[PDB]
Amino acid sequence: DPTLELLHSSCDPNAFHSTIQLYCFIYGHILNDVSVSWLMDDREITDTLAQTVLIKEEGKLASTCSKLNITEQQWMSESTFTCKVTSQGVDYLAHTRRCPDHEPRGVITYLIPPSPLDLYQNGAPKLTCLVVDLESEKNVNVTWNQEKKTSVSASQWYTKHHNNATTSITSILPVVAKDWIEGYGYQCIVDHPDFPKPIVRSITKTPGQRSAPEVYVFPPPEEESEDKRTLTCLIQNFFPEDISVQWLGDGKLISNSQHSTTTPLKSNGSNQGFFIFSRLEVAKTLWTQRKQFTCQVIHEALQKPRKLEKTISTSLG
Amino acid sequence: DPTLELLHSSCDPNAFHSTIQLYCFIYGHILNDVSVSWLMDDREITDTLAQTVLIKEEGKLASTCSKLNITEQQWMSESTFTCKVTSQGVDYLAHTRRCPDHEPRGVITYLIPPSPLDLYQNGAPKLTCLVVDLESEKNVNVTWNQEKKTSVSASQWYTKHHNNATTSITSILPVVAKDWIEGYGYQCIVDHPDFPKPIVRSITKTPGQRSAPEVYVFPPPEEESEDKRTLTCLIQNFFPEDISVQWLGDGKLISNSQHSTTTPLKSNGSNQGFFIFSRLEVAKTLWTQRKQFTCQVIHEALQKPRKLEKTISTSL
Amino acid sequence: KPKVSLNPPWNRIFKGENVTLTCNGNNFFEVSSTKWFHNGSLSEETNSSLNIVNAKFEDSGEYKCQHQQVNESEPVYLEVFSDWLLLQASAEVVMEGQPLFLRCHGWRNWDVYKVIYYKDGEALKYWYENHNISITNATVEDSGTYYCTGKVWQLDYESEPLNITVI
Numbered sequence A: 001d002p003t004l005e006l007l008h009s010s011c012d013p014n015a016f017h018s019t020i021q022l023y024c025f026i027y028g029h030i031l032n033d034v035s036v037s038w039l040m041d042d043r044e045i046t047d048t049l050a051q052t053v054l055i056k057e058e059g060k061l062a063s064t065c066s067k068l069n070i071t072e073q074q075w076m077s078e079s080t081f082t083c084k085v086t087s088q089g090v091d092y093l094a095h096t097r098r099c100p101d102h103e104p105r106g107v108i109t110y111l112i113p114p115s116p117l118d119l120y121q122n123g124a125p126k127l128t129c130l131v132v133d134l135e136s137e138k139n140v141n142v143t144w145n146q147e148k149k150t151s152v153s154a155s156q157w158y159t160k161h162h163n164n165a166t167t168s169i170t171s172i173l174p175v176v177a178k179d180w181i182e183g184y185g186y187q188c189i190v191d192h193p194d195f196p197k198p199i200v201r202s203i204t205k206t207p208g209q210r211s212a213p214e215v216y217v218f219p220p221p222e223e224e225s226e227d228k229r230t231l232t233c234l235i236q237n238f239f240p241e242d243i244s245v246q247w248l249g250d251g252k253l254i255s256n257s258q259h260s261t262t263t264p265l266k267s268n269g270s271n272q273g274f275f276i277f278s279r280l281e282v283a284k285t286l287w288t289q290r291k292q293f294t295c296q297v298i299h300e301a302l303q304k305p306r307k308l309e310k311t312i313s314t315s316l317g
Numbered sequence B: 001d002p003t004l005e006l007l008h009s010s011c012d013p014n015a016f017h018s019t020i021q022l023y024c025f026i027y028g029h030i031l032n033d034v035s036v037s038w039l040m041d042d043r044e045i046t047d048t049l050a051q052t053v054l055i056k057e058e059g060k061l062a063s064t065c066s067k068l069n070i071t072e073q074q075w076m077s078e079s080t081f082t083c084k085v086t087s088q089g090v091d092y093l094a095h096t097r098r099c100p101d102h103e104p105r106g107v108i109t110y111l112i113p114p115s116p117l118d119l120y121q122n123g124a125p126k127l128t129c130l131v132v133d134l135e136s137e138k139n140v141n142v143t144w145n146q147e148k149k150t151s152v153s154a155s156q157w158y159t160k161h162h163n164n165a166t167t168s169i170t171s172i173l174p175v176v177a178k179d180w181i182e183g184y185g186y187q188c189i190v191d192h193p194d195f196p197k198p199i200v201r202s203i204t205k206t207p208g209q210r211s212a213p214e215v216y217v218f219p220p221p222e223e224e225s226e227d228k229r230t231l232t233c234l235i236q237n238f239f240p241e242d243i244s245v246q247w248l249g250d251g252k253l254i255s256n257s258q259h260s261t262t263t264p265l266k267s268n269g270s271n272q273g274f275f276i277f278s279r280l281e282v283a284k285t286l287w288t289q290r291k292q293f294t295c296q297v298i299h300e301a302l303q304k305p306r307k308l309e310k311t312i313s314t315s316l
Numbered sequence C: 001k002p003k004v005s006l007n008p009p010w011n012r013i014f015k016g017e018n019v020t021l022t023c024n025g026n027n028f029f030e031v032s033s034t035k036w037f038h039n040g041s042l043s044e045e046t047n048s049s050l051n052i053v054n055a056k057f058e059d060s061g062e063y064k065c066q067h068q069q070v071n072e073s074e075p076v077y078l079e080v081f082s083d084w085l086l087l088q089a090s091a092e093v094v095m096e097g098q099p100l101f102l103r104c105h106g107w108r109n110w111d112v113y114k115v116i117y118y119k120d121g122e123a124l125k126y127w128y129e130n131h132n133i134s135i136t137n138a139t140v141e142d143s144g145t146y147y148c149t150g151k152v153w154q155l156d157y158e159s160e161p162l163n164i165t166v167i
């Protein structure tokens, strides 16, 4: 069971180099029984400059690298280069391609992850894919291939016009919180008549070790009779970026208008988590009326309820 | 020599492998004398996604494969992904990116106004004009139009060549504090031998009423594992956003690495001020030694000497 | 009277381009007899074709060509601009029904991407590759101001507004 690794060398911008080095590494193959084939769009290569040298020998095993030189013009022609190795009568093929290029003919793709508030709370989890800078919407289609899950949910896509004669298409697909927490991913694939190769964007959960955030509410610091009382709710050591902060002062949740949240910044040292501050400023008329003043934080690694509430009372001091 | 082959593996559109595995094949280094680091456009990569594994050893030749997991957005953002190897005190950096698509970026000018710290405390403000993405450093020069007021301010136009086939030119003008306090915008012009028009950028103090900032220091909340205290200094209702925040420990200035200041944001209040929560992380040892921490704020709306200090002790 | 024809269909040439002026006219002949006037001053050109190479700002103004004893031709105005985008048209004044060509042109014939055309403050067309606005049948509504915003060398720039008026 040999291991195949096909790689393409990096284009040096500083050095004046115009040849890309394709390396096909085969590990643990059969001694004296080897065969490496370079295919360009399912066609055998013609150039004989294929430098093949044994990397190393592991007794019954062997590791060998095949080296090929490719012109930049040929590589940019979207040629699907492939390395084929015949092991035990089975032809294993690996196709590289450069990197499915980039945004073609405009059309910028943004795959927005679900908001970290509708997963572990109310039921409305969805994933959205937005394509902007489109010349026209004719014969342009977006698919929502559900990786490793398939399911039965269907997506819905809608168009929108702007003041710069550009068309933006947004497609939303409902998802499942259990599927998201299990590690399943999705693939937004956009196909347009201009470029034959569709553009694919795959979204999964953010990698890393999840940690339980620490939430603390500070009492107002204003001395005597400042009209606009301020409450601070600090959240530290939370990973990944998915987290939401709200308030539930006296039943109904406080509107986002009288509340703000600072941008997340990476904490220096300590752990790998971030730190955020949420500030709630209210006139000195609700301070003598509101009593609950609870800051709630929703994170995907807190606990089974995925909720952490810190309550501050006005009957202090 | 540590010949760094920084190879980007196949991006695999068909498979669910969004993250690209940059392999930094390192050869020619010395055993147990090599340190590997990752940089994203001159910024250190701190996430622990590195999978540095020893492939093989042929004596002192240890084939090292450092695997960096980069998101598709990062790889396709035309970055400068740098594999840095430190050995025998010598650092070798290999820079990689995608093969060029679209047109190359043109020369772009950036203007940095003086910081309030050097404007109201040290009294040495400086205006910075930096042109980047420049092709050739020949027949390119920077002219500074003083506009209002006249003075002799001959300065430097120093050029630094980067490792991404680009060079930058930086010019710093030490200006007088009084002119900026009263308000006197200047202009920076960069001229290239073959350009349509020389690029001109103007700097002027932001108009608007100045409001005295309100500064409050919150004591550390409870005993959080007895490892970090995370002192908070909230500054609110100040305009403009140009402000200096510092932390002083027992009369000694604290480096900017320890304390993090959030970016200014437009508060929802009618004061049109900005709220910033400067967070200083201090361990148990620092806080338990009866150290008093002072949050210092420098802003133009404050009275003389444009400095406001709020000191918090541990015995309260 | 003869007609002054420019080899480039646009009278907004760059700084340093070549332009050929022809004093076209039927039943004239005598190519060796053709006087050229620049701001009313006679030039050194004698033939019916005048070539300008590496045009400067001083070459801007009114050009006139006279042949034999016929009356002087129209003083065609040629203006030289120096900016990132100087979108050109076939003519400042176009008769109704005549074709009209508008093209966003950048410095040294550099390729222009993300070309967006705006008429009197309202966007008209958007393209990723530079194209031509070709109005085969000019209408009254086409009158107004045209300007293009284009991304050249990954930098977005705005062109000089135009005065495209039809009769």
Ligand SMILES: *[C@@H]1O[C@H](CO)[C@@H](O[C@@H]2O[C@H](CO)[C@@H](O[C@@H]3O[C@H](CO[C@H]4O[C@H](CO)[C@@H](O)[C@H](O)[C@@H]4O)[C@@H](O)[C@H](O[C@H]4O[C@H](CO)[C@@H](O)[C@H](O)[C@@H]4O)[C@@H]3O)[C@H](O)[C@H]2NC(C)=O)[C@H](O)[C@H]1NC(C)=O
Residues within 6 Å of the ligand: A108, A110, A112, A132, A133, A162, A163, A164, A166, A168, C114
């Ligand atoms: C023609 O005009 C249209 C309409 O204005 C333009 O379309 C806009 O394009 C911009 C630029 O790509 C888009 O802005 C980007 O949107 C994404 C996120 O925005 C959504 O999500 C946030 C919440 O996360 C909402 O607040 C917001 O309303 C949107 O729903 C991101 O891709 C971008 O932000 C990310 O990248 C930037 C760096 O680029 C970082 O600074 C950010 O922190 C962040 O990481 C960015 O904000 C904008 O959404 C588009 N508008 C619409 C209505 O679709 C066309 O671009 C324009 N065409 C031309 C050719 O000029």
Ligand SMILES: *[C@@H]1O[C@H](CO)[C@@H](O[C@@H]2O[C@H](CO)[C@@H](O[C@@H]3O[C@H](CO[C@H]4O[C@H](CO)[C@@H](O)[C@H](O)[C@@H]4O)[C@@H](O)[C@H](O[C@H]4O[C@H](CO)[C@@H](O)[C@H](O)[C@@H]4O)[C@@H]3O)[C@H](O)[C@H]2NC(C)=O)[C@H](O)[C@H]1NC(C)=O
Residues within 6 Å of the ligand: B041, B042, B078, B079, B080, B105, B110, B111, B112, B130, B132, B133, B162, B163, B164, B166, B168
């Ligand atoms: C080849 O490599 C070089 C070297 O890395 C690159 O040059 C860098 O380019 C970046 C991107 O333009 C420059 O970063 C810009 O700097 C300015 C502000 O940064 C200074 O000030 C802040 C504090 O205000 C400091 O933290 C910082 O260290 C600097 O002192 C601004 O012009 C830019 O910020 C603005 O734009 C960004 C979006 O990019 C917004 O998020 C910001 O809010 C703001 O609006 C930006 O940060 C950097 O300075 C350059 N370095 C040098 C040494 O010149 C080349 O770009 C690269 N070439 C290619 C082709 O990739």
Ligand SMILES: *[C@@H]1O[C@H](CO)[C@@H](O[C@@H]2O[C@H](CO)[C@@H](O[C@@H]3O[C@H](CO)[C@@H](O)[C@H](O)[C@@H]3O)[C@H](O)[C@H]2NC(C)=O)[C@H](O)[C@H]1NC(C)=O
Residues within 6 Å of the ligand: C038, C039, C057, C058, C059, C060, C061, C062, C079, C080
């Ligand atoms: C013939 O008459 C015409 C009348 O237009 C003259 O054209 C004018 O020439 C002057 C001098 O070159 C131009 O001024 C210049 O304009 C720009 C402004 O950005 C710049 O290059 C210089 O700073 C200068 O001010 C002027 O614009 C131009 N007029 C037009 C409408 O294009 C022409 O020079 C005359 N020829 C002779 C030989 O006298």
Ligand SMILES: *[C@@H]1O[C@H](CO)[C@@H](O)[C@H](O)[C@H]1NC(C)=O
Residues within 6 Å of the ligand: A139, A140, A141, A191, A192, A193, A196
């Ligand atoms: C999707 O778009 C592509 C663009 O090439 C087109 O060939 C195909 O027929 C479209 N599919 C459907 C179902 O409309």
Ligand SMILES: *[C@@H]1O[C@H](CO)[C@@H](O)[C@H](O)[C@H]1NC(C)=O
Residues within 6 Å of the ligand: B139, B140, B141, B191, B192, B193
């Ligand atoms: C600045 O550069 C321009 C363009 O090359 C040149 O004409 C001018 O003389 C230069 N000025 C100096 C060197 O002072």
Ligand SMILES: *[C@@H]1O[C@H](CO)[C@@H](O)[C@H](O)[C@H]1NC(C)=O
Residues within 6 Å of the ligand: C016, C017, C018, C053, C054
């Ligand atoms: C103009 O013609 C000259 C020769 O007379 C030639 O060298 C030059 O390249 C031409 N310029 C343009 C812009 O075509």
Ligand SMILES: *[C@@H]1O[C@H](CO)[C@@H](O)[C@H](O)[C@H]1NC(C)=O
Residues within 6 Å of the ligand: C101, C103, C130, C131, C132
């Ligand atoms: C626009 O028209 C001009 C003049 O005929 C021509 O040279 C140019 O190629 C045209 N542009 C395009 C994009 O077809």
Ligand SMILES: *[C@@H]1O[C@H](CO)[C@@H](O)[C@H](O)[C@H]1NC(C)=O
Residues within 6 Å of the ligand: C145, C161, C162, C163
């Ligand atoms: C012509 O264009 C200019 C800007 O170049 C604009 O101010 C003016 O209103 C336009 N129309 C005229 C002069 O009729």
